[PDB]
Structure formats: C-alpha cells, structure tokens
C-alpha cells in the first residue's frame, strides 16, 4: 500500500505530466524496447525503426488513450481493482493481451518519468511509482481467467 507521503508524492509529480506526451513516449518506448509487444499493433502502420515507432501517429494516439486511463486511475489508488475491472475483462476476453505487458509498460513508464523529471524523480518517488505501476498492472490482470 502507498503511505500518505507516497500518495502525495505521486500526485505532486503527476500534476506536472503532459499525459498525451508521456503516453505516446511510454507506448512507443514499449514497442521499441520490447518489440514483441508490437504484435497487438499490426494495423498501426510503420513500426520499422525506433524513429518510425516513436513518430507513428497511431502509436501516439494509443499511448494517450492508455495513459489517460492510467492517469484517471491515479484518483482511485485505494480501488485499483474496481477501477480497472472492466478494462481487465476487456483486455483478457477481447484483446488477449498477456498481462506481463502491463508490467513492462509500467517499467517503461518509470524509465520515462525518470528521463523526464531527472533528479526530481528521486529514489523515494520512484519507490512510490513502483507501487503504483505494480498496483495498476495487478488490477488490469485481476479479471483474467
């Protein structure tokens, strides 16, 4: 569970995030760093190089959708399973996304926040975000069956 200080730390940093920018960046980096994750995005067009993935408008669009949902979930840190249940069911039942992808995206997101905020993304802040991304990934995998 996050402590009160950790919750505040997450909230404070996130207030400085450009969710569409960070989303586009985290999803693109997911596709570059862990390229097997491109299997869900064969209809997205050019994914041939790191620059093409990062600049792909459909990758960017999907990133803003995914991170906007993540973003909205930060308001329900004590009800992550409830918040993401229907999205968990969808990801399992219709999209067939292996829940490890949620963990991978979480780790890329942390790397992006570190890149973006530099020294402000301190060890304690990171520790707090690790609980958040673990918690979101666990929530998204919770309804898999």
């Amino acid at each position: 569970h996050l402590t009160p200080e950790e919750k505040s730390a997450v909230t404070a940093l996130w207030g400085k995030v450009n969710v569409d920018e960070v989303g586009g960046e985290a999803l693109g980096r997911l596709l570059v760093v862990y390229p097997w994750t491109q299997r869900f995005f064969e209809s997205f067009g050019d994914l041939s190089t790191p620059d093409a993935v990062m600049g792909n408008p459909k990758v960017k669009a999907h990133g803003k959708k995914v991170l906007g949902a993540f973003s909205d979930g930060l308001a329900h840190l004590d009800n992550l399973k409830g918040t993401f249940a229907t999205l968990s069911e969808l990801h399992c039942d219709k999209l067939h996304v292996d829940p490890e992808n949620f963990r991978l995206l979480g780790n890329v997101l942390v790397c992006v926040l570190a890149h973006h905020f530099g020294k402000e993304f301190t060890p304690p802040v990171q520790a707090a975000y690790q609980k958040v991304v673990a918690g979101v990934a666990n929530a998204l995998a919770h309804k898999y069956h």
Partner: protein, 141 residues
C-alpha cells in the same frame, strides 16, 4: 550450460518418454492453461477444453521440437532457429510464459516417470528446458 551428465540424463528421460512425447506435450499445455490462465491469451483461436484436437496437435509439435532439441543438444540454437524466428517475430509470446510451460513439462514428465525422475534427472531436465526457452526467446530483440 548443459553438462555431459545433464545431457545423459535428458536423453535417458526423453528416451523413456519415447512415443508418448506428443501426448505428454499436450498434457503439459493443458496443465499450463489450467494452472496459469494468462497463458491462454496466446490461443484465443483454440478450443482449450480437455481432449481438444487443437491442443493435442500443438502438443505434438512442441514435443517434436523438444525431441529435435534433445537430438541436437550440442547445437540447439540452429536446430530451433526457425522456431526462435517464429516466436520472436510472429507469435511474440512474452518470455515469462516459457518458464510456465517448462514447469508444466517437468510436471508432466514427473507424473509419467516414476523411476526416471530422480533429483538429478529433475535438475537436468529443468536446465534443459530453460536452455530451450532461452534459445526460443534469443531473437526477440
């Protein structure tokens, strides 16, 4: 790396499996699907019920690949290269799932090899399946 004793142990155990390898391959996939439900995300086009011909057909392929690996245990990367490509560039199964299928294969062998599955044979088979797994994910990035 697989030692000479590991290779001996793998060949003896797989040799005892013999003609049941395909059946054991399908059993291990059934074991995997039931035990680790997230692995089913890679097979939405399959009937995964007990006795499915799709699982049996795929179990035979997996087992045949393992037989091939046992047969070329000193040259596994090349024997499995087409499968490494397929998994890396087409199926794109997360690497974490290979450890789940390897445990289920091990369990399947244990349930069918009362004499053969000694601690040492178990250890060698674990190593072998991890090595096969490593080869299969070697081209992912």
């Amino acid at each position: 790396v697989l030692s000479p004793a590991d290779k001996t142990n793998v060949k003896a155990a797989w040799g005892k499996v013999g003609a049941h390898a395909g059946e054991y391959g399908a059993e291990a996939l059934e074991r995997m699907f039931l035990s680790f439900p997230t692995t089913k995300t890679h097979f939405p086009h399959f009937d995964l019920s007990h006795g499915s011909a799709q699982v049996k057909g795929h179990g035979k392929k997996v087992a045949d690949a393992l037989t091939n690996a046992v047969a070329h245990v000193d040259d596994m990367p090349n024997a499995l290269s087409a499968l490494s490509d397929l998994h890396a560039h087409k199926l794109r199964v997360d690497p974490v799932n290979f450890k789940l299928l390897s445990h289920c294969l091990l369990v399947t062998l244990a349930a069918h090899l009362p004499a053969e599955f000694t601690p040492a044979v178990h250890a060698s088979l674990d190593k072998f399946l991890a090595s096969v797994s490593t080869v299969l994910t070697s081209k992912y990035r």
